Enzyme design. Structure first.
Site, PDB file in Angstrom:
ATOM      1  N   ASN A 119      42.533  36.563  35.071  1.00 50.90           N
ATOM      2  CA  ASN A 119      43.014  37.960  35.039  1.00 50.90           C
ATOM      3  C   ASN A 119      44.473  38.015  34.607  1.00 50.90           C
ATOM      4  OD1 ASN A 119      43.742  40.368  37.679  1.00 50.90           O
ATOM      5  ND2 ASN A 119      42.727  40.828  35.712  1.00 50.90           N
ATOM      6  N   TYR A 167      48.884  52.048  34.166  1.00 53.66           N
ATOM      7  CA  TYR A 167      48.868  51.100  35.279  1.00 53.66           C
ATOM      8  C   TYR A 167      50.169  51.181  36.035  1.00 53.66           C
ATOM      9  CZ  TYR A 167      48.745  46.698  37.801  1.00 53.66           C
ATOM     10  OH  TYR A 167      48.813  45.743  38.796  1.00 53.66           O
ATOM     11  N   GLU A 197      47.654  50.628  44.108  1.00 54.34           N
ATOM     12  CA  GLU A 197      47.591  50.249  42.680  1.00 54.34           C
ATOM     13  C   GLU A 197      46.757  51.285  41.945  1.00 54.34           C
ATOM     14  OE1 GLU A 197      45.314  46.708  41.760  1.00 54.34           O
ATOM     15  OE2 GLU A 197      46.810  45.991  40.433  1.00 54.34           O
ATOM     16  N   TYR A 255      45.289  53.418  38.193  1.00 49.54           N
ATOM     17  CA  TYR A 255      44.822  53.246  36.828  1.00 49.54           C
ATOM     18  C   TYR A 255      44.397  54.561  36.240  1.00 49.54           C
ATOM     19  CZ  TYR A 255      44.105  48.203  37.539  1.00 49.54           C
ATOM     20  OH  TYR A 255      44.240  46.804  37.696  1.00 49.54           O
ATOM     21  N   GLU A 279      44.836  45.023  30.124  1.00 47.93           N
ATOM     22  CA  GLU A 279      44.395  44.115  31.209  1.00 47.93           C
ATOM     23  C   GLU A 279      43.145  43.403  30.716  1.00 47.93           C
ATOM     24  OE1 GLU A 279      44.159  45.502  35.283  1.00 47.93           O
ATOM     25  OE2 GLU A 279      42.775  43.918  35.856  1.00 47.93           O
TER      26      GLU A 279
END
EC number: 3.2.1.8
Length: 185
Positions: free
Chosen positions: A35, A69, A78, A80, A172
């Site tokens: 990742n 992000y 977090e 998105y 990502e």
């Protein structure tokens, strides 16, 4: 607007060649990865920001996201706004929908538990997602009116923190290869 922040993080898997270009531009070529998240934007995020971008290349080979992000603290979140992806469209606990910037997005939450974050190697937090219902066209100028997402999230009881970390337009990936080229303003 000018950008002032460069995001470039990898878990160490594969090879990520992320290049911090002139102005708002960056590129990524990646292969055989774990990742990773790369992007350009702002050191201090805002729930009022309009993010403009033009992704001249969006060529994931496998699982990658082209996404706003960022994070908050107090609490740790977090978040998105996913405009496009590769072979995997991210989903989670389904909340509802929001219309913004000519698209319709599904809203999800997911939980990370004993996971890495801006707070440490092993932390717990919620992820907030808006995910477009269809991959957004690339190569022309595009806008994310982030306030429309923040307001829709609040209506579904998803409150962001009061302490704003960085906020970027990101590439990502997970266990994939590909390329992207994106200009942010």
């Amino acid at each position: 607007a000018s950008t002032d922040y460069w995001q470039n993080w990898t878990d160490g898997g594969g090879i990520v060649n992320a290049v911090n270009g002139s102005g708002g531009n960056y590129s990524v070529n990646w292969s055989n990865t774990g990742n990773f998240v790369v992007g350009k934007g702002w050191t201090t995020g805002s729930p009022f920001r309009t993010i403009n971008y033009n992704a001249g290349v969006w060529a994931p080979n496998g699982n990658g996201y082209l996404t706003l992000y960022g994070w908050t603290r107090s609490p740790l979140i977090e978040y998105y706004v996913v405009d496009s992806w590769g072979t995997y469209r991210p989903t989670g606990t389904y909340k509802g929908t929001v219309k913004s910037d000519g698209g319709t997005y599904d809203i999800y939450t997911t939980t990370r538990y004993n996971a890495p974050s801006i707070d440490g190697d092993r932390t717990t937090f919620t992820q907030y997602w808006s995910v477009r219902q269809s991959k957004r066209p690339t190569g022309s100028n595009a806008t994310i009116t982030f306030s429309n997402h923040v307001n829709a999230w609040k209506s579904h009881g998803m409150n962001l923190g009061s302490n704003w970390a960085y906020q970027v337009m990101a590439t990502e990936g997970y266990q994939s290869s590909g390329s992207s080229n994106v200009t942010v303003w």
